[PDB]
Amino acid sequence: GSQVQLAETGGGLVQPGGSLRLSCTASTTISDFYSMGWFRQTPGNQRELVAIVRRGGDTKSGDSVKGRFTISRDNTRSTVYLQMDNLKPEDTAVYYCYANLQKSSDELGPYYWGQGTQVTVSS
Amino acid sequence: QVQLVESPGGSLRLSCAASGSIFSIYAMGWYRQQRELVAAISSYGSTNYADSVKGRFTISRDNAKNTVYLQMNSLEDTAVYYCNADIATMTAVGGFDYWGQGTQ
Amino acid sequence: LQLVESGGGTVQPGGTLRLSCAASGFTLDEYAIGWFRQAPGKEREGVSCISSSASISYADSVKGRFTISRDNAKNTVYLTMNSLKPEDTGVYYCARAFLACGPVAGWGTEYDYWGQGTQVTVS
Amino acid sequence: LQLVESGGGLVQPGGSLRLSCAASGNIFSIYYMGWYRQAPGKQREMVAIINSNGITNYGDFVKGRFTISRDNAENSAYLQMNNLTPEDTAVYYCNAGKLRRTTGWGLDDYWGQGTQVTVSS
Amino acid sequence: QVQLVESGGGLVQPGGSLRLSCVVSGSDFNTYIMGWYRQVPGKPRELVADITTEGKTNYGGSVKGRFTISRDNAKNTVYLQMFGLKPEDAGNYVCNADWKMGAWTAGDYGIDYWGKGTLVTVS
Amino acid sequence: VQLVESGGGLVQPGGSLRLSCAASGFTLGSRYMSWVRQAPGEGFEWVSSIEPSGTAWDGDSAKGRFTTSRDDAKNTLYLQMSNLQPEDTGVYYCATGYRTDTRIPGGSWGQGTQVTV
Amino acid sequence: PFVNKQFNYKDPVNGVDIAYIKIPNVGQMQPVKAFKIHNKIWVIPERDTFTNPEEGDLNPPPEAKQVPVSYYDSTYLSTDNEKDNYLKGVTKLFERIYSTDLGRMLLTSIVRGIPFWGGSTIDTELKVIDTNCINVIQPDGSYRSEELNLVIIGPSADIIQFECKSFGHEVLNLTRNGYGSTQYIRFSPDFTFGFEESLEVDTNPLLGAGKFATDPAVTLAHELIHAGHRLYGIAINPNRVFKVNTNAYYEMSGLEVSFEELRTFGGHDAKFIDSLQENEFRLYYYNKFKDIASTLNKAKSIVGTTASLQYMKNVFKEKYLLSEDTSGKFSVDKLKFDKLYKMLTEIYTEDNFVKFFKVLNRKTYLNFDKAVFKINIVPKVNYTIYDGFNLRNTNLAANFNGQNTEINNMNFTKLKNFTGLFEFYKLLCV
Ligand SMILES: [Zn+2]
């Protein structure tokens, strides 16, 4: 296998209304990566897409973080940064880094996931 | 139904035609008799000859007419030359070999 | 889903027996059938096997004497045993394996179903 | 495909701006054209999309202020933005969709460089 | 091969009653899942009532508990008793002889037998 | 394979309670486990499940209120219930498998624990 | 008989043919209830929101950005009755395909097309690949890794976007190196397309309403042909493409069709791939089969199974129809390769299934779908295994009256007219 590994940093406790930033650095260059971003899996529920960016720079985001979750990608440093504002207790979840290395839309290309980073929001 | 029809130091050209309700043919070949293989042509042009007739025998095939040709030149080779064809019928897709009577 | 062996019995040396292996639970076009035997007190050994594409294998102990055949219409694998010797005494089992045949010795769990067997004595 | 954008910049609140975007094919190649906008911190909302059949879709924030047009001859779209409010300050990306038939009917999303629009004074 | 002839159709007034009967030839009547379908041109056959090999009766939506299906295995006959007939019940009533072919029924294939039908009319 | 649930009883409406199940004869972290409940005179209702990976899955029977955990050291499964309602009254079982709805040959159950509210 | 058991969706699990499964490639999905209708063939009667993490919801795009041929209904396949009817409809289509010798041969090739055991870094060791397996949860709570060939899954957001996909390897191209990989087909038996009888009509985007409905058995056989190509690793690269020049409306739209789709339909469409490109692919995949036989001959150890190495070598000898000499060495006979290659690429075509089913169908892939209909093939009064919609000894038996959406109008409920979304082609009549 290719053995791509993703390294997550920056997930702790924050209070309602506060902000928090997550970063994910890959072991290799993230240029030919079809997409790379963040998913979250709230306790007991299915994993949902937070926000990812593709090779061109367009960002795809879920509906439950509008006006709050901003994402940026840096190919030179091989890192994706996720910024989250106006945090609500519903946002308490495990945030997984995500990288899709599709060679094409023909095959469900190799998916790489981070080990998971806990983000808890409580007063 | 379906059946087949066939037609020293010299030249001879053999041919074999298939007929009937044919739904594709996979591989046709000539056999000679104990019977051994002498030449086998595929539907894509792949050939396989026995060492006895390598070089002086040429097998060819036309798919639009379902006919195989065997050009024999510079003739131990005196025996019965059979025609084999793996013909698929619509009720038996991809199977069953077929033979003729065999000419001298 | 059953595999039954039939046709065993007692026969003089030099006699011939044809054993049948009826598959009453599935179609054989996807399964190879291997014939095995277990001598009195000895370990079970492999006799023969026929593949889903009618690829036949025998053991060094029965070549030229035994013949294994295939009847897909009646879903039965036969074993015609000729030139019988007293050393061929034992219980003959037939087992199924997906698509391909296993080795006549040192096989694994590819034979995922075995019949109860039939008894063959040569005296 | 190549998209060229035009006509961004700074506007007084209540003023008007007309964005432009030209595509490298024709209306039969490009099925839809339009505009998205990326707020400072609010995902990437859809502003206006027009179809080759004339079907239009505007974001809920538009409220009849913006009208999207398409010139079929030169295969270019225009977005006339009237009564621009400070909360319309964002970067507006031209969007285009190429009709595909390679492995069935489909559309390829192709984006532009993006032009800054700032409603401030 | 096997034929089904239906009888007992005619004219009836709103609220009247009728008795339809169908005799089936052959030696496999006990195998059959007998039933009655209303055959309408341009529309698929709709199930009025059927009965299984052991006698369990199932009825359609329009019957509203007004019909009764019975089978006499000793006569190879099935019966459809109709009470309180409305003009919506008019049409050709065809008898059906289905049977189980393993995972699927014979009509699902469908090689089941269908009669020509007896006509029921209201005024 | 033995499972013994414990920790039921009475809880006035809106409270909490922590149910536990002590396993033996198998590693609990190596199988899919489930929490199942049953009201008097009704069928079973799947409450929750947990993967060998530790990922839990809550059904609509009680989502957002309940959390399913596991202690690998003590080989014990847990069901942390909160905001209880009379609809949650019943015998709560811990059964092997995922989304266990009924008694299936091969599956293992405990004898259950009564939870009344 | 292809499906021996009659599955009901609410039947309890057993860990054998009915169970909750996780797919190793995703792993983030919650387990879904799956049914094993045959050897190496599973069915998951749910909307596909789990295989692709970037396609995890059924939300449709805005109306203007929707493909002209598309249909969206987030409530479809959400109830237990829809899933149970989905399951019975898919199995019924499998039997209808199996009822023809062409379909029986295709399904046989699919079953024995086990993806290759070539995932080990050691060149002399055979190892399974995570792409070609699923985790089958047992009533014990334990999970069993089971290798498989094909999975039928419900559609994603676009209900009528049927396709045959597979998970990609990190290093290898499993679909184009002879290895093969487990195929996942998004498909629905509850919908079908509306086409037109005439060729000049069906290939014109401006006229046509969907007078005849596609037999869903043909639509399923189409994606099965894609799965057959990909299970033996002989699929043509999707970038190898024929730019259409026969249809004027295709031309002006810049439309192009992949060689894989043209090969899958067969008929006259397969002739757009010239003989030089066909020889390129055949010789290419012949060397791929040669590499597999070479790897098998160098195999000395096997890992991850209690099965013997000789069995695994013989398994892939059976799949690729290799030849074995007295020494036990494997070789690829090129004539037997041409037989298998022609069966997968020329025999198993959509056009041939139309001939075997004796139904009306699109006469080319280079056409314009006219509409989409809601259908229900489960009742025997609507659809049979041997006859489809053209029920024998009825008025539907002649002239394809069963597929006629006006004659047999009660079997087809039009949901969306695609012709109205192709009306932009009116602007080239200036
Ligand atoms: Zn296709």
Numbering used by the authors:
A (entry chain E): -1 to 121
B (entry chain G): 1 to 7, 14 to 39, 44 to 85, 88 to 116
C (entry chain B): 2 to 124
D (entry chain F): 2 to 122
E (entry chain D): 1 to 123
F (entry chain C): 2 to 118
G (entry chain A): 2 to 431
Give sentences from the paper.
All BoNTs have a catalytic light chain (LC), which is a Zn2+-endopeptidase that specifically cleaves neuronal SNARE proteins and is mainly responsible for BoNT’s neurotoxic effects, while the heavy chain (HC) mediates toxin attachment to neurons and delivers the LC into the cytosol. Here, we aim to develop single-domain variable heavy-chain (VHH) antibodies targeting the protease domains (also known as the light chain, LC) of BoNT/A and BoNT/B as antidotes for post-intoxication treatments. Using a combination of X-ray crystallography and biochemical assays, we investigated the structures and inhibition mechanisms of a dozen unique VHHs that recognize four and three non-overlapping epitopes on the LC of BoNT/A and BoNT/B, respectively. We show that the VHHs that inhibit the LC activity occupy the extended substrate-recognition exosites or the cleavage pocket of LC/A or LC/B and thus block substrate binding.
Therefore, the C-terminus of LC/A appears to adopt at least two distinct conformations, referred to as the β-form stabilized by JPU-B9 and the α-form captured by JPU-C10. Two potent LC/A inhibitors, JPU-A5 and JPU-C10, bind to the deep active site pocket present at the LC/A β-exosite where the cleavage site and the C-terminus of SNAP25 become associated. JPU-C10 buried a surface area (BSA) of ~1215 Å2 on LC/A (calculated by PDBePISA v1.52) with a surface complementarity (SC) score of 0.731 which is higher than the average SC value of ~0.7 for antibody-antigen complexes. JPU-C10 does not occupy the S1’ subsite of LC/A. Rather, its R102 and G105 interact with S2’ and S3’ subsite residues N368, Y251, and Y366 of LC/A. Additionally, its W106 forms hydrophobic interaction with the S5’ subsite residues Y251, L256, F369, V70, and F423 of LC/A. The CDR3 of JPU-C10 is so close to the cleavage site that its binding should impose steric hindrance that occludes SNAP25 access to the cleavage site pocket. JPU-C10 not only interacts extensively with the S1’–S5’ sites through its CDR3, it also binds to the C-terminus of LC/A that forms a helix in the complex. JPU-G3 binds LC/A with BSA of 916 Å2 and a lower SC score of 0.629, which is mainly mediated by its CDR3. The ALc-B8-binding epitope on LC/A is partially overlapping with that of ALc-H7, but ALc-B8 employs a different binding mode. The interaction of ALc-B8 with LC/A results in a BSA of 777 Å2 per molecule and a SC score of 0.739. We found that F29, Y32, M102 and V105 of ALc-B8 bind a hydrophobic patch on LC/A that is formed by M106, L103, F357, M344 and I348 and should compete for LC/A binding to SNAP25 residues V153, I156, and L160.
